[PDB]
Coordinates of N, CA and C in Angstrom, one line a residue:
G1 N 18.7 -2.0 -0.2 CA 19.1 -3.3 -0.5 C 19.0 -4.2 0.7
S2 N 20.1 -4.9 1.0 CA 20.1 -5.9 2.1 C 19.0 -6.9 2.0
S3 N 18.8 -7.4 0.8 CA 17.8 -8.3 0.5 C 18.1 -9.3 -0.7
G4 N 17.9 -10.5 -0.5 CA 18.2 -11.5 -1.5 C 17.6 -12.9 -1.3
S5 N 17.7 -13.3 -0.1 CA 17.2 -14.7 0.3 C 15.9 -14.5 1.2
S6 N 16.0 -13.7 2.2 CA 14.9 -13.5 3.1 C 13.6 -13.1 2.3
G7 N 13.7 -12.0 1.6 CA 12.6 -11.6 0.8 C 11.3 -11.6 1.6
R8 N 11.2 -10.8 2.6 CA 9.9 -10.7 3.4 C 8.7 -10.6 2.5
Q9 N 7.7 -11.5 2.8 CA 6.5 -11.5 2.1 C 5.4 -10.6 2.7
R10 N 4.4 -10.2 1.9 CA 3.4 -9.4 2.4 C 2.3 -10.2 3.1
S11 N 1.7 -9.6 4.1 CA 0.6 -10.2 4.9 C -0.7 -9.6 4.6
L12 N -1.8 -10.4 4.6 CA -3.1 -9.9 4.4 C -3.8 -9.4 5.7
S13 N -3.0 -8.6 6.4 CA -3.5 -8.1 7.7 C -4.5 -7.0 7.5
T14 N -4.1 -6.0 6.7 CA -4.9 -4.8 6.4 C -6.4 -5.3 6.1
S15 N -7.3 -4.5 6.6 CA -8.7 -4.8 6.5 C -9.1 -4.8 5.0
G16 N -8.9 -3.7 4.3 CA -9.2 -3.6 2.9 C -9.3 -2.2 2.4
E17 N -10.1 -1.4 3.1 CA -10.3 0.0 2.7 C -9.0 0.7 2.7
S18 N -9.0 1.8 1.8 CA -7.8 2.6 1.7 C -8.1 4.0 1.3
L19 N -7.1 4.8 1.1 CA -7.3 6.2 0.7 C -8.3 6.3 -0.5
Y20 N -8.3 5.4 -1.4 CA -9.2 5.3 -2.5 C -10.6 5.8 -2.1
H21 N -11.0 5.2 -1.0 CA -12.4 5.6 -0.4 C -12.5 7.1 -0.2
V22 N -11.4 7.6 0.5 CA -11.4 9.0 0.8 C -11.9 9.9 -0.3
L23 N -11.7 9.4 -1.6 CA -12.1 10.1 -2.8 C -13.3 9.5 -3.3
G24 N -13.3 8.2 -3.7 CA -14.4 7.5 -4.2 C -14.1 6.5 -5.3
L25 N -12.9 5.9 -5.1 CA -12.4 4.9 -6.1 C -12.3 3.5 -5.4
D26 N -11.8 2.6 -6.2 CA -11.6 1.2 -5.6 C -10.1 0.8 -5.8
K27 N -9.8 -0.4 -5.3 CA -8.5 -1.0 -5.4 C -8.0 -1.1 -6.8
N28 N -9.0 -1.3 -7.8 CA -8.7 -1.4 -9.2 C -8.7 -0.1 -9.9
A29 N -8.4 1.0 -9.1 CA -8.3 2.3 -9.7 C -6.9 2.7 -10.1
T30 N -6.8 3.2 -11.4 CA -5.5 3.5 -11.9 C -5.1 5.0 -11.6
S31 N -3.8 5.3 -11.4 CA -3.4 6.6 -11.1 C -4.2 7.7 -11.8
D32 N -4.5 7.4 -13.1 CA -5.3 8.4 -13.9 C -6.7 8.6 -13.2
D33 N -7.3 7.5 -12.7 CA -8.6 7.6 -12.0 C -8.5 8.5 -10.8
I34 N -7.4 8.4 -10.1 CA -7.1 9.2 -8.9 C -6.9 10.7 -9.2
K35 N -6.1 10.9 -10.2 CA -5.9 12.3 -10.6 C -7.1 13.0 -11.2
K36 N -7.7 12.4 -12.2 CA -9.0 12.9 -12.7 C -10.0 13.2 -11.7
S37 N -10.4 12.1 -10.9 CA -11.4 12.3 -9.8 C -11.0 13.4 -8.9
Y38 N -9.7 13.4 -8.4 CA -9.2 14.4 -7.5 C -9.6 15.8 -8.0
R39 N -9.6 16.0 -9.3 CA -10.0 17.3 -9.8 C -11.4 17.7 -9.5
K40 N -12.4 16.9 -10.0 CA -13.8 17.1 -9.7 C -14.0 17.3 -8.2
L41 N -13.4 16.4 -7.4 CA -13.5 16.4 -5.9 C -12.8 17.7 -5.4
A42 N -12.0 18.3 -6.2 CA -11.3 19.5 -5.7 C -12.0 20.8 -6.1
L43 N -12.7 20.8 -7.2 CA -13.5 21.9 -7.7 C -14.8 22.1 -6.9
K44 N -15.4 20.9 -6.5 CA -16.6 20.9 -5.7 C -16.3 21.3 -4.3
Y45 N -15.2 20.7 -3.7 CA -14.9 21.0 -2.4 C -13.9 22.1 -2.2
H46 N -13.9 23.0 -3.3 CA -13.0 24.1 -3.3 C -13.2 25.0 -2.1
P47 N -12.1 25.6 -1.5 CA -12.2 26.4 -0.3 C -12.8 27.8 -0.6
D48 N -12.5 28.3 -1.8 CA -13.1 29.6 -2.2 C -14.6 29.5 -2.6
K49 N -15.0 28.3 -3.1 CA -16.3 28.1 -3.5 C -17.2 27.9 -2.2
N50 N -16.6 27.4 -1.2 CA -17.3 27.2 0.1 C -16.6 27.9 1.2
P51 N -16.9 29.3 1.3 CA -16.3 30.1 2.4 C -16.9 29.8 3.8
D52 N -16.0 29.9 4.8 CA -16.4 29.6 6.2 C -17.2 28.3 6.2
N53 N -16.7 27.3 5.6 CA -17.4 26.0 5.6 C -16.6 24.9 6.4
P54 N -17.2 24.3 7.4 CA -16.6 23.3 8.2 C -16.4 22.0 7.5
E55 N -17.4 21.5 6.9 CA -17.4 20.3 6.1 C -16.4 20.4 5.0
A56 N -16.4 21.6 4.4 CA -15.5 21.8 3.2 C -14.0 21.6 3.6
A57 N -13.6 22.1 4.7 CA -12.2 22.0 5.2 C -11.9 20.5 5.5
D58 N -12.8 19.9 6.2 CA -12.7 18.4 6.5 C -12.4 17.6 5.3
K59 N -13.4 17.7 4.3 CA -13.3 16.9 3.1 C -12.0 17.3 2.3
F60 N -12.0 18.6 1.8 CA -10.8 19.1 1.1 C -9.5 18.7 1.7
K61 N -9.4 19.0 3.0 CA -8.2 18.7 3.8 C -7.9 17.2 3.7
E62 N -8.9 16.4 3.5 CA -8.7 14.9 3.3 C -8.2 14.6 1.9
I63 N -8.9 15.2 0.9 CA -8.6 14.9 -0.5 C -7.1 15.3 -0.8
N64 N -6.7 16.5 -0.5 CA -5.3 16.9 -0.7 C -4.3 15.9 -0.2
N65 N -4.4 15.5 1.0 CA -3.5 14.5 1.6 C -3.6 13.2 0.9
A66 N -4.9 12.7 0.7 CA -5.1 11.4 0.1 C -4.4 11.4 -1.3
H67 N -4.9 12.3 -2.2 CA -4.3 12.3 -3.6 C -2.8 12.6 -3.5
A68 N -2.4 13.5 -2.6 CA -1.0 13.8 -2.4 C -0.2 12.6 -2.1
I69 N -0.7 11.7 -1.4 CA -0.1 10.4 -1.0 C -0.1 9.4 -2.1
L70 N -1.2 9.4 -2.8 CA -1.4 8.5 -3.9 C -0.6 8.9 -5.2
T71 N -0.3 10.2 -5.2 CA 0.5 10.8 -6.3 C 2.0 10.6 -6.1
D72 N 2.3 9.6 -5.4 CA 3.7 9.3 -5.1 C 4.0 7.8 -4.8
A73 N 4.9 7.3 -5.7 CA 5.2 5.8 -5.5 C 5.8 5.5 -4.1
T74 N 6.8 6.2 -3.8 CA 7.5 6.0 -2.5 C 6.4 5.8 -1.4
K75 N 5.5 6.7 -1.2 CA 4.5 6.6 -0.2 C 3.5 5.5 -0.6
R76 N 3.0 5.6 -1.8 CA 2.0 4.7 -2.3 C 2.4 3.2 -1.9
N77 N 3.7 2.9 -1.9 CA 4.1 1.6 -1.5 C 4.1 1.5 0.1
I78 N 4.3 2.6 0.8 CA 4.3 2.5 2.2 C 2.9 2.3 2.8
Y79 N 2.0 3.1 2.2 CA 0.6 3.0 2.6 C 0.0 1.7 2.2
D80 N 0.6 1.0 1.2 CA 0.1 -0.3 0.7 C 0.7 -1.4 1.5
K81 N 2.0 -1.3 1.9 CA 2.7 -2.3 2.7 C 2.4 -2.1 4.2
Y82 N 2.6 -0.9 4.7 CA 2.4 -0.7 6.1 C 1.0 0.0 6.3
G83 N 0.8 1.2 5.8 CA -0.5 1.9 6.0 C -0.3 3.3 6.5
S84 N -1.2 3.6 7.5 CA -1.2 4.9 8.1 C 0.0 5.1 9.0
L85 N 0.3 4.0 9.7 CA 1.5 4.0 10.7 C 2.8 4.2 9.9
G86 N 3.0 3.4 8.9 CA 4.2 3.5 8.1 C 4.6 4.9 7.8
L87 N 3.6 5.7 7.3 CA 3.8 7.1 7.0 C 4.5 7.8 8.1
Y88 N 3.9 7.7 9.3 CA 4.4 8.4 10.5 C 5.9 8.1 10.7
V89 N 6.3 6.9 11.0 CA 7.7 6.5 11.2 C 8.5 7.0 10.0
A90 N 8.1 6.6 8.8 CA 8.9 7.0 7.6 C 8.9 8.5 7.5
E91 N 8.1 9.2 8.2 CA 8.0 10.7 8.2 C 9.3 11.3 8.8
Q92 N 9.6 10.9 10.0 CA 10.8 11.4 10.7 C 12.0 10.4 10.4
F93 N 11.8 9.2 10.8 CA 12.8 8.2 10.6 C 13.3 8.0 9.1
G94 N 12.3 7.8 8.3 CA 12.6 7.6 6.9 C 12.2 6.3 6.3
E95 N 11.8 6.3 5.0 CA 11.4 5.0 4.4 C 12.4 3.9 4.6
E96 N 13.7 4.2 4.4 CA 14.8 3.3 4.5 C 14.8 2.8 6.0
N97 N 14.5 3.7 6.9 CA 14.5 3.4 8.3 C 13.4 2.4 8.7
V98 N 12.2 2.6 8.0 CA 11.0 1.8 8.3 C 11.3 0.4 7.9
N99 N 12.4 0.1 7.3 CA 12.8 -1.3 6.9 C 13.1 -2.1 8.1
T100 N 14.2 -1.7 8.8 CA 14.7 -2.4 10.0 C 13.5 -2.5 11.1
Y101 N 12.8 -1.5 11.2 CA 11.7 -1.4 12.1 C 10.7 -2.6 11.9
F102 N 10.2 -2.7 10.7 CA 9.3 -3.8 10.4 C 10.0 -5.2 10.2
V103 N 11.0 -5.2 9.3 CA 11.8 -6.4 9.1 C 12.0 -7.2 10.4
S104 N 12.1 -6.4 11.5 CA 12.4 -7.0 12.8 C 11.1 -7.1 13.6
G105 N 10.4 -8.3 13.6 CA 9.2 -8.5 14.3 C 9.0 -9.9 14.7
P106 N 7.7 -10.3 15.0 CA 7.4 -11.6 15.4 C 7.6 -12.7 14.3
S107 N 8.1 -12.2 13.2 CA 8.3 -13.1 12.0 C 9.8 -13.5 11.9
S108 N 10.1 -14.6 11.2 CA 11.5 -15.0 11.0 C 11.6 -15.9 9.8
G109 N 12.8 -15.9 9.2 CA 13.0 -16.7 8.0 C 11.8 -16.7 7.0

């Protein structure tokens, strides 16, 4: 909570690209698109299908995290508002903790 008047607004700082790319979708991609796609991208980049494969681990390792992050509102909002950094802080500190951290910056009123 602790919000009613301030209502911090979002800034168009982010470049544009996001996890969506990691898989092959766009900003106009619906959760369903992420889940469905994740499947095909998981069966092809399967660890068992590609034994002792360097590129396989890199890709798959990326898909899991990507989808795993997109398959969650809590984070989905963090990666959308903050991004990669937000996840870190919110990792140990906590989503609620990431509030005071950001809320307090070069911005005011």
